């Protein structure tokens, strides 16, 4: 449990270290992907 909890603290430090830099455009790209998915559902409604 001592070794495992030290690896949990290493995973919290790793999760901070990834999360603290990773502010990106990609969230707005996922909003464009949801808009494109909405166009494919409108094309499916047109086919129906």
């Amino acid at each position: 449990f001592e070794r495992m909890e030290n690896k949990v603290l290493d995973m919290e430090a790793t999760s901070q270290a990834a999360g603290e830099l990773a502010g990106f455009g990609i969230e707005n790209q996922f909003a464009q992907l949801e808009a494109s998915s909405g166009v494919e559902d409108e094309l499916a409604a047109l086919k129906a």
Partner: protein, 144 residues
Amino acid sequence: DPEKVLEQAVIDMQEDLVQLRQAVARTIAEEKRTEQRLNQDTQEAKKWEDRAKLALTNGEENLAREALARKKSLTDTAAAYQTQLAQQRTMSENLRRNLAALEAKISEAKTKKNMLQARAKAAKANAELQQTLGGLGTSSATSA
């Protein structure tokens, strides 16, 4: 040369912003590790509450009050780690906002200097052409 001086200043700023990325990555690890600590302390507080429920089922009020005192100690310790976490969260965001501001300032400074250098070189070249074209031909015609 001011061009070499401002390029070196921008290079020094790359070292400083890389140290600020290291400070963000450190602070990210501290907030994640202190979250992990309070998360496991609150899970142990549930285990000690269940130890009190078993003691109360057996009629051992002495063991139940001791187990509840362990629950109290663990939830107070998790509140101490949540208080420290709040300091790591505000520091993490402060370093992040300072990094975004520093990167923007470097980019603007370098591009404004680059266009000013190009305009200054054209201005001196135009002035040099006025000095060479302005003197010639007149002394040639007078000498002839």
